[PDB]
């Protein structure tokens, strides 16, 4: 459950998410009518003095049975047009992104591993 001011991990190969500038990116906004962000929910990110959109692909909060609970809050950086900023994702991504309402096919194309 990502909220405002939560520290999140950029699970991507994009330059902005690299370990330099150790300060973790923090959530500024959750694009939901509730402010709670779950898997598949977009958020606005404070990263390296920039404001960038990100998509939640994993979090530590328990979900419904038969679904993966991760050890970190993961996100992928998204361009304003909606194209992913990074070109590869190596960490496992839950398969539930496929069905839920939204535009997630672009991200799934980038990720080899699904869990």
């Amino acid at each position: 459950a990502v909220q405002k001011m939560t520290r999140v991990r950029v699970v991507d190969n994009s330059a902005l998410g690299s370990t330099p500038y150790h300060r973790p990116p923090r959530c500024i906004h959750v694009y939901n009518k509730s402010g709670v962000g779950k898997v598949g929910d977009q958020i606005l990110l404070a990263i390296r003095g920039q404001k960038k959109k990100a998509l939640i692909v994993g979090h530590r909060m328990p979900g419904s049975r038969m679904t993966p609970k991760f050890d970190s809050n993961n996100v992928v950086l998204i361009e304003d047009n909606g194209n992913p900023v990074g070109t590869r994702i190596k960490i496992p991504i839950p398969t539930s992104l496929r069905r839920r309402e939204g535009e997630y096919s672009k991200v799934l194309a980038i990720a080899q591993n699904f869990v």
Binding site: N13, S105, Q112
Partner: protein, 95 residues
Amino acid sequence: TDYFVIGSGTSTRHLHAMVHYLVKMYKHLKCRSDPYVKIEGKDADDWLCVDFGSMVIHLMLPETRETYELEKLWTLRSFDDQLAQIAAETLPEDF
């Protein structure tokens, strides 16, 4: 998915037309039991992808194609060059 399809297009106008054309044909061509398909990426000007049940087609302009190189990722499952460049880390104390 069972199949993965990538298609280049000259301009954003061309990408929209073919995406609409295929969607129109899909609804016309049976799919009575199968549900409808959303068109993704209309906000973007260079990459459109439609996720049919058994097939996913990603349409993009030339320049976008080389940048992402989707074909290499799915052809070489885990031996992709960009995926290989990424590395794992551990974090002990500085001193």
